[PDB]
Design an enzyme around this catalytic site. Structure first.
Site, PDB file in Angstrom:
ATOM      1  CG  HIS B  59      -0.556   0.219   2.565  1.00  0.00           C
ATOM      2  ND1 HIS B  59       0.336  -0.592   3.189  1.00  0.00           N
ATOM      3  CD2 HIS B  59      -0.345   1.287   3.140  1.00  0.00           C
ATOM      4  CE1 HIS B  59       0.733  -0.249   4.674  1.00  0.00           C
ATOM      5  NE2 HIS B  59       0.820   1.394   4.593  1.00  0.00           N
ATOM      6  CG  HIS B  61       0.408   6.742   4.072  1.00  0.00           C
ATOM      7  ND1 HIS B  61      -0.098   5.971   5.401  1.00  0.00           N
ATOM      8  CD2 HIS B  61      -0.381   7.977   4.139  1.00  0.00           C
ATOM      9  CE1 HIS B  61      -0.948   7.116   5.815  1.00  0.00           C
ATOM     10  NE2 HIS B  61      -1.193   8.050   5.416  1.00  0.00           N
ATOM     11  CE1 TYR B 122     -11.856  34.445   2.988  1.00  0.00           C
ATOM     12  CE2 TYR B 122     -13.705  34.749   5.085  1.00  0.00           C
ATOM     13  CZ  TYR B 122     -12.991  34.897   3.468  1.00  0.00           C
ATOM     14  OH  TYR B 122     -13.515  34.944   2.372  1.00  0.00           O
ATOM     15  CD  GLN B 126     -12.828  38.914   2.349  1.00  0.00           C
ATOM     16  OE1 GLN B 126     -13.440  38.297   1.548  1.00  0.00           O
ATOM     17  NE2 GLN B 126     -11.677  38.142   2.286  1.00  0.00           N
TER      18      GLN B 126
END
Ligand SMILES: [Mn+2]
Lengths: 126, 127
Positions: B59, B61, B122, B126
């Site tokens: 596998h 990852h 953030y 604005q």
DNA sequence: CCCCTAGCTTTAGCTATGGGGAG
DNA sequence: CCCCTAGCTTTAGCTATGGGGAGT
């Protein structure tokens, strides 16, 4: 915890935040009440899992689980888009005071901690 | 930390894991070496940020940063699909011993911690 | 950096790894 | 639970909140 779509085993949770135009603190009282209603309805319609969702004067905060095959932006599009249209029909000031309810901007942050021991069970389940 | 696409401010990181068909431990030696090469190439081509990526016998990852507007499944499709095709052309046993290199399944886990204080900047950004 | 466009729903109003354009 | 299909790249081999049919 985790959930499975056709062969895809997922656990996808996002922290979404967006503000109305000009950061106008209009998401209050009946408006914020209606906002959360419509988003819950949208979530049910788009099989989105609304975990956390609190509203503040100049922005909304949503924490949702979304099928990676569906897409975060698709949910956001229906959420922002429907809310703007519906709200602007009920609360007239939203239409007269603003050209649009929201901006073409949003904040997306992936949330979740490295789930060791769930990776191994997935593998052995193969 | 955070990156900005056209008006979208994002930080999306996923833990992706998938295994070859029948869990055949074929991802070793030159095969695992080539696997990681191709995926890196794909990542550059799809503007995907490969953070962590270790391979194991049965596998792989990957921990990657993907623009939410692009889509995780798009990256996964190109990764599994290209690898399978290319590998099966170099390492013949992969084609003869298996009908396909991978299965139609994968593991997707979102990773990241609640970034308080980035949310506020953030908002204030604005205007 | 901003206005336009196609795509799609809310058929109005928001997305598109979006586009083209200053000068 | 699985084989088929359309969509798209790798033009082979993998995804689609996928589909439809058999199905404790
Ligand atoms: Mn807040």
């Amino acid at each position: 915890l985790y959930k499975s779509n056709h062969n895809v085993v997922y656990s996808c949770k996002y922290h979404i935040v967006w503000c109305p135009k000009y950061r106008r603190k209009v998401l209050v009282g009946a408006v914020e009440m209606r906002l959360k209603e419509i988003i819950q309805e949208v979530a049910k319609e788009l099989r989105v899992e609304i975990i956390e969702m609190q509203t503040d004067k100049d922005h909304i905060h949503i924490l949702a689980d979304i099928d990676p095959s569906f897409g975060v932006m698709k949910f956001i599009k229906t959420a922002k888009g429907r809310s703007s249209r519906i709200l602007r029909q009920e609360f007239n000031h939203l239409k007269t005071k603003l050209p649009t309810l929201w901006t073409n901007s949003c904040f997306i942050s992936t949330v979740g901690g490295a789930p060791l021991n769930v990776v191994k069970q997935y593998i052995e389940n193969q």
